[PDB]
Amino acid sequence: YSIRLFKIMGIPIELHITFILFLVVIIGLSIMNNSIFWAVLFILLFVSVVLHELGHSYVAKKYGVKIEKILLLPIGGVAMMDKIPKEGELRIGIAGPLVSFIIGIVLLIVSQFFDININGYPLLYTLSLLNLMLGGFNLIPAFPMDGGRILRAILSKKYGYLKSTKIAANIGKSLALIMLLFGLLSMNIILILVSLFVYFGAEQESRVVEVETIFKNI
Amino acid sequence: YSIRLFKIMGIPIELHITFILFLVVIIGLSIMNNSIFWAVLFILLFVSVVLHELGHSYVAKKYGVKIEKILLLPIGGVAMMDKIPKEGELRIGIAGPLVSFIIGIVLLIVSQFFDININGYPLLYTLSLLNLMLGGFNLIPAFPMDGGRILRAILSKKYGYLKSTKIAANIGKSLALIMLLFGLLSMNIILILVSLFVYFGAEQESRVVEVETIFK
Ligand SMILES: [Zn+2]
Ligand SMILES: [Zn+2]
Numbered sequence: 049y050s051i052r053l054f055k056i057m058g059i060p061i062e063l064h065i066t067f068i069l070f071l072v073v074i075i076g077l078s079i080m081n082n083s084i085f086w087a088v089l090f091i092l093l094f095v096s097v098v099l100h101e102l103g104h105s106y107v108a109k110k111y112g113v114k115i116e117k118i119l120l121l122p123i124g125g126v127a128m129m130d131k132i133p134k135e136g137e138l139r140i141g142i143a144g145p146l147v148s149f150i151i152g153i154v155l156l157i158v159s160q161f162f163d164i165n166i167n168g169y170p171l172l173y174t175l176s177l178l179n180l181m182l183g184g185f186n187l188i189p190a191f192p193m194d195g196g197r198i199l200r201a202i203l204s205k206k207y208g209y210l211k212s213t214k215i216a217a218n219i220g221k222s223l224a225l226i227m228l229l230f231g232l233l234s235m236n237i238i239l240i241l242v243s244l245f246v247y248f249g250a251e252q253e254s255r256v257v258e259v260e261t262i263f264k265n266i
Numbered sequence: 267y268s269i270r271l272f273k274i275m276g277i278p279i280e281l282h283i284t285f286i287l288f289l290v291v292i293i294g295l296s297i298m299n300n301s302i303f304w305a306v307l308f309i310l311l312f313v314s315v316v317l318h319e320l321g322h323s324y325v326a327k328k329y330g331v332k333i334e335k336i337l338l339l340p341i342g343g344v345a346m347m348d349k350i351p352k353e354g355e356l357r358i359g360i361a362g363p364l365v366s367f368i369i370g371i372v373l374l375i376v377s378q379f380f381d382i383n384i385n386g387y388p389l390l391y392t393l394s395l396l397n398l399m400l401g402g403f404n405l406i407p408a409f410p411m412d413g414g415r416i417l418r419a420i421l422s423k424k425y426g427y428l429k430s431t432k433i434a435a436n437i438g439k440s441l442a443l444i445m446l447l448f449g450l451l452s453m454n455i456i457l458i459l460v461s462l463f464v465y466f467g468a469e470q471e472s473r474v475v476e477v478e479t480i481f482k
Pocket of ligand 2: 404411
C-alpha cells in the first residue's frame with residue numbers, strides 16, 4: 049500500500065506506509081518538542097533521495113525502462129524496476145551517485161552567493177552537504193551501496209559474476225560486523241541499527257546471486 | 267619502515283612497504299600473463315593517490331601547515347603531521363576525498379567524449395573509477411583511511427587523543443582482521459591484500475612517538 053504523490057521526469061513517485069508512519073512519527077516529534085529543523089531535514093533528505101534515485105533511473109531507461117514506480121522506504125528510496133542488463137550496471141550504478149554529487153557540488157557553490165536562513169540553518173548549504181554525503185557514501189565499494197554494484201561490474205568479467213559479487217558483498221559484511229562490534233560496544237543504537245541494514249543488505253545479495261548461479265549451473 | 271622516493275614543496279614523500287608489496291604483486295601479475303594493464307594500473311593508482319594526498323595537504327597549509335612527511339599507500343596517505351587547528355580536522359580529512367571524488371567524476375564524464383587507449387585499456391575512464399573508489403573507500407570510519415582522522419575528531423573531545431587514537435586505530439585492525447578471514451577463507455587475494463594495507467596502515471597511525479635519523 050503506497051500513496052501517489054506526483055510524477056517527475058515520467059516516473060511515478062510513491063510513499064510507502066512504512067515511510068508514512070515513519071514520517072508521521074517525525075512530524076509528531078517535531079511538535080512534542082521544538083525539533084523544528086529535524087522535520088525539515090527529513091524532508092530535504094528524502095527530496096534529495098528522490099533525485100538520486102532518479103538519475104539512477106534515467107541512465108537505466110536508456111537500457112530498458114523497467115521503471116514502473118518509485119516508492120520511498122524510510123531507509124532511503126527504491127526505484128521499482130525489472131530486468132537489469134549485466135553490461136549496463138556499471139553505468140546505472142554510478143548514475144545515481146553522479147546526480148547527487150553534481151547537485152551537491154552546485155548547491156554548494158551557490159550556497160555561498162545566496163541561501164535561506166531558517167533559525168540560522170541555511171537550507172541550500174545544508175542540502176549540498178547531504179547530497180555530497182549521499183553521493184560520496186554511495187561509492188564505498190560494498191553492498192548494498194551503489195559502489196557495490198559498481199565494484200562488482202569492474203570485476204565481473206574477470207572474476208566471474210558470483211565471485212566478483214561475493215567480494216563486494218563480503219566487504220559489506222566486513223564493514224557491518226565491525227560497525228556492530230562498536231555500536232554494541234558503546235551501546236549506541238543507531239550505529240547498531242545501521243550495521244544491521246548494511247549487513248543484511250550485503251547478504252541478501254550473496255544469497256540470491258548464489259542461489260541463482262547454482263540454478264544456472266543446472 | 268618505508269623507502270624514500272623524492273620530495274616536493276619541501277615535504278618528504280615516501281612509499282610504505284604496503285606499496286612495495288602491492289608493487290611486487292603487480293610485477294608478478296605482469297608475468298603471470300602478458301600484462302601491460304597491471305603495470306598501468308599501479309601507475310594510475312599511484313598518481314591518483316598522490317593527488318588525493320595533495321588535496322589533504324593544501325587545505326592543511328591554509329591552517330596549521332605542520333606538514334613534515336607524507337607516506338603513500340595504495341589505499342591513501344598517512345601524511346604524518348602534528349597540531350591540527352580546530353576545524354582543520356573535519357576539513358583536512360574530507361579535503362582529500364573530495365579531490366579524489368571530483369577528479370573521478372570529471373575524468374568520468376570526459377572519458378565518454380574522449381580517452382587514451384593503451385593496448386586497449388582506456389586511461390581516463392580507468393582513472394576516474396580508481397579516484398571514485400579511492401574517494402568513497404576512504405569514507406569508512408577506521409584507520410588509516412580518512413574516515414578515521416575524522417572519526418577520531420568527532421570522538422576526541424569525549425575521550426582525548428592518546429586513547430581516542432587507539433579507538434579508531436583499533437577499529438582498523440579489527441576491521442582489517444575480519445576482512446582477512448574473508449579473503450583468506452574465500453581465497454580472494456584482493457580482500458587479503460587490502461586487508462593488509464589497512465592493518466599495517468593502522469599499525470602506522472596508532473603510533474604516537476617516532477625516533478628517526480637524518481643525513482642531509
Ligand atoms: Zn543508489
Ligand atoms: Zn587520505
